[PDB]
Amino acid sequence: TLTTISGHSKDNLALLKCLQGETKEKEFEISNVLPNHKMKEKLFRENKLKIDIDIEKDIFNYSRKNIQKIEFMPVNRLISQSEIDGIIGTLKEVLPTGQFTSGPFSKKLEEVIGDYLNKKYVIATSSGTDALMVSLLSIGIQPGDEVIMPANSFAATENAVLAIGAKPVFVDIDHKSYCIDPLKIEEAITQKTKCILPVHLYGKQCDMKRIREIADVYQLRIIEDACQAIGSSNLGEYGDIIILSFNPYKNFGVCGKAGAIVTNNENLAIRCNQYSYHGFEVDKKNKKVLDFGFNSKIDNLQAAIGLERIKFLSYNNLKRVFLAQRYIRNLKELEDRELIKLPRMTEDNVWHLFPIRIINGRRDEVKNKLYQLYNIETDIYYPVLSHKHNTKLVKKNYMQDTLLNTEQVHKEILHLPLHPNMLLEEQNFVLEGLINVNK
Amino acid sequence: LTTISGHSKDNLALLKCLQGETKEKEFEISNVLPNHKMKEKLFRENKLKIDIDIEKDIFNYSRKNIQKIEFMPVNRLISQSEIDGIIGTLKEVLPTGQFTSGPFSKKLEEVIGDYLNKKYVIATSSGTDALMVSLLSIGIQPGDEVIMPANSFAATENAVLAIGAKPVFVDIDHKSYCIDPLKIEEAITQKTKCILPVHLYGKQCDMKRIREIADVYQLRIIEDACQAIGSSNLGEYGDIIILSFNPYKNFGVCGKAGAIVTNNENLAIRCNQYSYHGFEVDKKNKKVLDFGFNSKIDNLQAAIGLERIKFLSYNNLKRVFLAQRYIRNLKELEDRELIKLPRMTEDNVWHLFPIRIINGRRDEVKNKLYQLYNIETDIYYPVLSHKHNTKLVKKNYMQDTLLNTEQVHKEILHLPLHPNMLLEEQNFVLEGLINVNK
Amino acid sequence: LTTISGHSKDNLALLKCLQGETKEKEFEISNVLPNHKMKEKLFRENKLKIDIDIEKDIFNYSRKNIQKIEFMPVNRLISQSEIDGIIGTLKEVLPTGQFTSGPFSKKLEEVIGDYLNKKYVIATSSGTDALMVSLLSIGIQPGDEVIMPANSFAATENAVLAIGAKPVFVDIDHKSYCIDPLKIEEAITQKTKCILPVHLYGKQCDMKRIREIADVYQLRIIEDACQAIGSSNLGEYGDIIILSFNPYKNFGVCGKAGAIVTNNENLAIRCNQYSYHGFEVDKKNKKVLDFGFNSKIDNLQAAIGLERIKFLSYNNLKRVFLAQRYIRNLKELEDRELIKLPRMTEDNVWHLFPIRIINGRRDEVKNKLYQLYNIETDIYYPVLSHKHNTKLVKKNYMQDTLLNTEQVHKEILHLPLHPNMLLEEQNFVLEGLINVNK
Amino acid sequence: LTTISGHSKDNLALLKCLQGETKEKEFEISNVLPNHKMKEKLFRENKLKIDIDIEKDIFNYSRKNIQKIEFMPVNRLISQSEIDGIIGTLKEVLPTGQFTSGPFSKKLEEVIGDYLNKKYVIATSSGTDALMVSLLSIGIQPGDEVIMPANSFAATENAVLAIGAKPVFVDIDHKSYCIDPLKIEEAITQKTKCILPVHLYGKQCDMKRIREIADVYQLRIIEDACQAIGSSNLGEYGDIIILSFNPYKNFGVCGKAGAIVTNNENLAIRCNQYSYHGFEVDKKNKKVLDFGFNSKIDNLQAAIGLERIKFLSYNNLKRVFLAQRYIRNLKELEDRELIKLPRMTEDNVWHLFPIRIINGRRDEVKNKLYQLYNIETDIYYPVLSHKHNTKLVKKNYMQDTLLNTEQVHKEILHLPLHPNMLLEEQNFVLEGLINVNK
Numbered sequence A: 001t002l003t004t005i006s007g008h009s010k011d012n013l014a015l016l017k018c019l020q021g022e023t024k025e026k027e028f029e030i031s032n033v034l035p036n037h038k039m040k041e042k043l044f045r046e047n048k049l050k051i052d053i054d055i056e057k058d059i060f061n062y063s064r065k066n067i068q069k070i071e072f073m074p075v076n077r078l079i080s081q082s083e084i085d086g087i088i089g090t091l092k093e094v095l096p097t098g099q100f101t102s103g104p105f106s107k108k109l110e111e112v113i114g115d116y117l118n119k120k121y122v123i124a125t126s127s128g129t130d131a132l133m134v135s136l137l138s139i140g141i142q143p144g145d146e147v148i149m150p151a152n153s154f155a156a157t158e159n160a161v162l163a164i165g166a167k168p169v170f171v172d173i174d175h176k177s178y179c180i181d182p183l184k185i186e187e188a189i190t191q192k193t194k195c196i197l198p199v200h201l202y203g204k205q206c207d208m209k210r211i212r213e214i215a216d217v218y219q220l221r222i223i224e225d226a227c228q229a230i231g232s233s234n235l236g237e238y239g240d241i242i243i244l245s246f247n248p249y250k251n252f253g254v255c256g257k258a259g260a261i262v263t264n265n266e267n268l269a270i271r272c273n274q275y276s277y278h279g280f281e282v283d284k285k286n287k288k289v290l291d292f293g294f295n296s297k298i299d300n301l302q303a304a305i306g307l308e309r310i311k312f313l314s315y316n317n318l319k320r321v322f323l324a325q326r327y328i329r330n331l332k333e334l335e336d337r338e339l340i341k342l343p344r345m346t347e348d349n350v351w352h353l354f355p356i357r358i359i360n361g362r363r364d365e366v367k368n369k370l371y372q373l374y375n376i377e378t379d380i381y382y383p384v385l386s387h388k389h390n391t392k393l394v395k396k397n398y399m400q401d402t403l404l405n406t407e408q409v410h411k412e413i414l415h416l417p418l419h420p421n422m423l424l425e426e427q428n429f430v431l432e433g434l435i436n437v438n439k
Numbered sequence B, C, D: 001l002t003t004i005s006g007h008s009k010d011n012l013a014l015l016k017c018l019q020g021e022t023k024e025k026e027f028e029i030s031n032v033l034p035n036h037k038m039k040e041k042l043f044r045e046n047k048l049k050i051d052i053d054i055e056k057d058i059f060n061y062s063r064k065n066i067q068k069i070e071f072m073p074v075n076r077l078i079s080q081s082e083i084d085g086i087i088g089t090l091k092e093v094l095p096t097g098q099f100t101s102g103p104f105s106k107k108l109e110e111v112i113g114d115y116l117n118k119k120y121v122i123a124t125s126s127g128t129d130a131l132m133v134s135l136l137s138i139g140i141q142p143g144d145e146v147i148m149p150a151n152s153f154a155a156t157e158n159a160v161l162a163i164g165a166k167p168v169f170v171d172i173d174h175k176s177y178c179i180d181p182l183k184i185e186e187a188i189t190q191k192t193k194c195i196l197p198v199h200l201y202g203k204q205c206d207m208k209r210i211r212e213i214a215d216v217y218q219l220r221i222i223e224d225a226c227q228a229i230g231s232s233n234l235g236e237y238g239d240i241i242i243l244s245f246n247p248y249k250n251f252g253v254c255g256k257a258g259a260i261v262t263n264n265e266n267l268a269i270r271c272n273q274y275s276y277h278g279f280e281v282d283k284k285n286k287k288v289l290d291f292g293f294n295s296k297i298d299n300l301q302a303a304i305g306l307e308r309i310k311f312l313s314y315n316n317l318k319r320v321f322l323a324q325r326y327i328r329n330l331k332e333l334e335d336r337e338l339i340k341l342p343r344m345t346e347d348n349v350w351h352l353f354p355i356r357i358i359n360g361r362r363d364e365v366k367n368k369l370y371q372l373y374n375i376e377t378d379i380y381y382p383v384l385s386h387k388h389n390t391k392l393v394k395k396n397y398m399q400d401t402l403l404n405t406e407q408v409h410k411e412i413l414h415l416p417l418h419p420n421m422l423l424e425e426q427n428f429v430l431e432g433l434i435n436v437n438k
Ligand SMILES: Cc1ncc(COP(=O)(O)O)c(CN)c1O
Pocket: A127, A128, A129, A130, A153, A154, A156, A157, A199, A201, A225, A227, A228, A244, A245, A246, A247, A257, A258, A259, B294
C-alpha cells in the first residue's frame, strides 16, 4: 500500500501511472537522498504526495503558448534558473577554499553516487571517456587485447579501447532494444578477448543477466558503459565496473566534463584511483606505484556543481518518462499504419534519447521534410557506425565487418526531441508535424 | 619609453625602475588581458603611478606577527577580487548552457595565442592531456622514443607512457635544472622522434642549442612549459608548446585546464581532432583520425581563465620581487659556501624557487627548518623518474645513470614563494634559513 | 514585430503578450540601459524566451506563508544583484577621486536624455533642487505666482516657496488625481509665471490641454515628473521636466539625486549655471548669474544610478502586473459600490496605487486593515497644501476651497505596491481588503 | 604627558616633538575616530613609536624623480586604505536599503559634535545648504543685511543671496586673509542681522573681538568653517558653525555633505526642520515651518564619512609638516622682499597655502612656474565678490572699494599642498620657486 520513491526508473514509472490516474490506489513516500531533492520539494508535502497534481499545468506549465520552431537539444534550455541560483550559492563557498583539484565535494559526490547505485567504491573522473580508459587499464587490458562492443554507440566507447592500444571487436545488436545482442557475443570470443563492453544506449539497459552468463563461462570482465543510463533501476547488478558520464547534456550533468567509475571490487577500485592520478599511491603524491597514469579525477568545483544539479535528477527523469509515454501514445497510429516503429515502455529506460524507426526507406525523407517544411529538428544519434568511419583504421581492419541488424536499423533510426524542460506545446508541435508529414 | 608586454623581461625592467635602480625611465602598459590587474594597480593615465611603494602598496607590509610558514596554502592563491569577477562571469556563462565547447574557450585561445605570439591554440582539459595530444599529433607511435629529463613532475613522462612511447632520460645541466643540450645527441637513436625539454620551475631551457641538434636529426621539439607562462620569447624554437592552467600555476583556472600552442597548422588541426574523439573539426560524430580523447577545455573554465589571467603579469611581478629578495638576503650563506642560489635572469617566471644545500646538509636543514623554526619547505620532486618502484622502472631504467640529476637531487630545496605571501612571511623564512646555518 | 523601448506603453503590450492575451506577437528589445535587466531576464537570442512563466520566473511564487504586510520596507527595494553591480562600479569610481562633477554624471545625463528623447539634461542633487533651479531658470522672481495642485508631496510647493514665489492652488479632476485643466485659466493673474502640473502616483496629467492654455497666456510649464519615470511620451508639451531619483522612486540611486530635462538650450544653460553657484559653464569661480546653489548630482551617485537604472523597465513591468492584478481581483468591491479603482492606462507607471473608499469608510477600512489584518496601507499625502498648521497657511490660504481635492482626500487609500513584492504578499492584501468589506 | 585630541594645537606640538625641536614630552592619543589613522600609524600601546622618521615613515621619501606638479589632483586625495574601508562599510549599508536618513547620519552627527565640543549637529547635503538653512534658522528675511568678506568661495555670498538677504562686504586684515574686525562696526546698519566670518584657507578669524562687536549690536555670528575642520577651539564664540565635508576638504566624504553645529537648541530644532521640508522632526508630511529644503546628509555618505574621518588628524599633521617645510625653505625669498610667507600658528589647519608675490610679479611668476617648470599654482579665488560679471554687481556693488582685499588679490598665489603629496614633489615646487626668482 506504500511505495518509497528511490529516485530510479522503476518507481518513476509507477509514480507516473498514479499521477495519471492509471492506478490511483497506491500511496507514495519519497527517500531523502539528494537525487530526489527537487521531486520531494515539488510533488510532496510532509512526505506524502500532494493532492491533485496537474502534470500538464503544475509540472510542464502548459498555457497554450504558440510555437514556431523546435530545436533538438537547445543547450540554453537544459539548465534552469533554480539550478543556476544553487550553483552560484555553492561556488561562493567553494571558491574561497582554493581547493580546485581534489577536495571534499569530490568525496561527497562519490558517496552520493555510491549510495544511489548501491556500489561500494566510486572514483569521480574528469569525463566518462576517461573513466572508461582507466577502467580498462585497471582490469589489466594490454595492447592487442580484444574488447567486444556494439558498433552503434557514441565514439567515446570505441575510442577509449583504441586509446590504450586494445582492439574493438564489434557484435551486432538485437531487434528490440538497440543494445548488444547477447546471442552473438559468444561467437566473437577469442583467445585475445578480455572484456565485454555493453552500452546502455539511449537510456535503455542491455540484458546483463545473459551477458554475465557468457562472461562467467569464459572468465571475462564486464565493463558497462552506462553513460546515458543514470537513474535506471538495478544498474550494474551484473558488471565488474560501471561507467557513468556527467556531461552537461546527460540526464544528470555538471557544468563541464565529469564522469565516474563505479564498482564493488576493491582491487579494481584502488587501481582506478591510482591510474586516474599519475599512477601515484593514493594520497602519496609524487610516488608512483603503477607504470603511469592520467590526470583524470573530477574537479572539486564540478563536484560541487554536481551536488547541486543532481537534486533535479529524479524529477527530470520523471518528466522524460512522461514525455516518452506521450510520444508513444500519440504516434501509435503511425505504428498501426506500418509507417514507423515506436519504442515500448519498460521499467529500466531513463529516456535519455527517444528513438523511432521510419520504415520502407522513408527515414531521410521524413527527417528532411520535418526540418524544411515544419521547422522541427530531429537527429540521428549516431550518424556513422564504428566500422564505417572514413579512417585509416577502418580501411585497415574493419572493411570485412558486416553487422546486419545494426546496419539496417541505422537506415531507419530517428530521434525525437525529448528533454525535461521542453514545453508540452513544443512536443505537440513535433507530434503534429510527424502526423502531418506521414500522409 | 617602453611598453610593458606582461612577460618576464619587461617585468624585470619594471621592478628595477620601481626599486629606484634605474635611470629616469618611463613606462606604458599594453592593454592586453594579462596586464589588466597591473594596469589598475600600478598605472594611472597610461603612465606609472608616481606614488607607488612596493612594500606598502604591493605587499601590504604591516609588521604582522608570523608564527609559522606553510609552503603553498591553497586558499592564498586566489584573491577576493578574483572571486567576485569569477562569480560575475559565471552568471554570464551559466544561462547559455554552453558547457563543453563555446565562445569563452575560443576567446581564451585567442588571448593565449596573442600572449605567446603564436598562430594556433587548442585549449585542453589539462596540461597532461595537451602533452599527450601533441605527441600524437607529431606522429608518435607505440615504441617511439622521446628524449626528456628525469627530474620533472610525473605528468611529463606519463603523457609519453600513456600513448605507448618510451622515455629516454638525459642528464640535466650544471646550473639551471634543465636538460643538458650537450647530452642529447648521444641519446638519439633510430627510434627517437621528439625532444621534450621541460622549462622547470619557471626557467627556460637553452632552446636555441636544442633546436640546432633537432634540425640535424630532423626531430620535433615539444616544450613542456607548464610552469613557465609569461616567460619572454617562450616557444621561439619549438614545434609545439604545452601550457598548464592548473590552479597552482602562475596562472590557473578553478579546476584543470591547459593548452597546445603552435604555428604549424597541420599539427594544430591534428591536435584539435585528437583532442575531441578524432572527429573532423566542427563535425561531431564523424571521425577523420583513428581515435581521440575528450580533452578540450571546459567553456566554463575558459570563462574563469579569462577572469583570472587578468592577474598574471602583476602576480609574476610579485614573484620576481620575492625571488630577488631571497637572492639578495641569502647572499651571505652562499659566500660562506653553505648554499648555492639561483641567479636573476630575464626568462625566469619563478614558479618555484630552488636553492641547493651542499656538503650533504639538505635533509638536516629541511627537517630543522620545519621542526625547530616552523617553516615548511619542499622538494619538487621527491623521486626521480628512473627511481620509482614500478615494474616499468625495474624492467627498463635500472641501468640509467644521470650523475648531475642524482647529485642535484640530494641538494635541492624549494623555499615558499607565491604572489600573495607577505614580506613578513618571507622575513620569517629568511630568519630561519640564516639561523639554521649559523 | 515591436521593439520594447522600456517605457510604459510597450510594457503594457508586453504584459498582454506574456499573459496570453495576445495574438501571435513578436518582440525585440531596444539595447538601452533601462532595458538591461529585462533583456537578460526575458529575452534570449534577441527574442522573448518561449518558456516564461510570470508567477514562477518573475515573482518567484512558492506558496510562502505570509503573516503581515508592510507598505514599503526599504530593504526590499534593492536586490542583491543591484548591490553586486554597485560595489563593482564603486571600485571603478573611488580611485578616480572624482566626487563632484565627473564622467558618470555626464553619462547619466546622456542616458536620461536618450530615454526621455530630450536634448539637454542637468543631473541634480535632488528633485526638490531640480525644481527650485528650473523655476529660477524661467525667471521666477519673488512674488511671482505658480499654479499647482494642493495634493502633491510637500517638495513641490516648497521649491516654489524657497525662492520667494507664491503657490496658487487649483482643484484636481474627477478621474486621475491630477490638476484639472478646466480650472487653470481662472487662476491666471498678471503675476502668474508658471503652471506646475504634478504627474501624481505615476500617472500623467492631461498635458495637451494644459499646453493649450499655457500657449494662449504664454506661460511656461514645468512638469513635476518625480514619480513618473518611464511614462511614455513624458514631457512632450512641457518646457522643463523634473525627475527625482530618490531611493524610493521607480528608479532611484542610493542617496538623493534628480534631474532637469529640456529641449530649450537657453533654459538648460541657466539651469546649469544656477545649479552650480551661478558660475559660467566650466568656469569655476567665475559667476555670470547673480548667485546659485550647490545642486549638481554627485558623480558617485550617478555611477550608482547607471547600475540601478538597468532594472527600470523590468521593475516597471512588475509594477503594472501588480496594478492589473489589484484591479482585476478587487472588481467585485467596486461592483458593490464600496470602492473606486484606478483604470489601466498606457501612461501610468504605478509608483503608487490609489483606491477610493467611499461612503465615509476610508478610516475604518485603513485602521481595520492594520489592526485586524496586519496590513499596512498609507495615505500619500496626509495633509493638503492649504491645510498645514503653519503661519503661511494661516495668513495666505485660509479662504482656499478645493472641493474635489478635499473630497477625494477623505476617500483615498494607497495599497502596497513595489516591484519586489511577492504575489503571496499581494494575495494577503487582497484577502484582507475582501474580508474587511464583507 | 599630552593627550593628542586630534586638533590643530596638539598636531603642532607633536610635530615639534617628532622633529627633535623638543624631545622631552610624552604623548598619548585619544580614542576618537578622527585620531584612528594617527593612533595606528604613530603609536603602539598608546605611546609614541620610537623609530619615527617623518620623511621615510610618513612621506615614504624614495628619491623619486618628478616631472610635473598638478595643484590638486583629485585621484591623489583618497588612499587605497580609505577605499578598502569604504567598500567594507558600503557592503553593510547597501542591504539595509536606508539611503536617506539612517543610523550612520546620526553616528556622524555624534562624532562631529564630540570633536567640536558642541551639543547639536545637523548633518546636511552640503556646506552651502548648511549655511542657507542656518541663515533661515536665525530668522534672516529678504532684505536683511549680512556682513562678510569679499574673498571667500562664492558659496558664502550665494547662501545669503539665495534667501534674499544682502551681503555687505568688509575689507580683510593685513595678516591672515580674514575679515578685519576693526572694519566690521562701521558697516553695521539697522538692517544688519548677522556677521558671517570666513576661516579662510584653514586659518581662524579673530573671533573674540568679532563676538565683542556682535554682542554690543545684538547680532548673530554664523562662522563659515568649511575649510577649517580640526582647528583648535573652533566655534567658541559663534552661534552656529558651518562645516563642509566636500571631498577636497581636509576631511571629506565621496560626494557632497556638510554640517550645522551649535549649542543653541532652538536654532538646532529650526535647522533640522528647515533641512527636511519644514516638517516636524520625526513626523514626515506634517509641516511646522512655512517651507523647507531637502538638505540632510545621505546615510550612505555619512557611512563613508565615518571611514574617511579616521585619517583626519593624521592628514592634518602631514599638512602642517608640509606648510612648515614651505615656510622654512622659502624664507630666502621673503628675506629678499620678493614674497610674503604665512607664519606658523596653532589654529591653522593648512587647507590652502597662500603666499604673496609682491612688486607686481605674481602673474609672471605663476605663468613661468607653469610654462617653464611644469608647476601648477592656483589663485583661490580668481574673482572677488564685488567684481563678478553679473547684473547684481552692476546694480549694487559698483561703489564698493575694499583696499586691502583688492591689493592682496593682485599678490596672492597658492602653493600645492595636500597630505598625500610626495616630499619629492614639494622639493620640485621649492626648486622652481627659487629658480624663477633668481
Ligand atoms: C554512450 C556514451 N558513452 C560514453 C560517453 C563519453 O562520456 P563523456 O562525454 O563524459 O566523456 C558518451 C557521451 N557523454 C556516451 O553518450
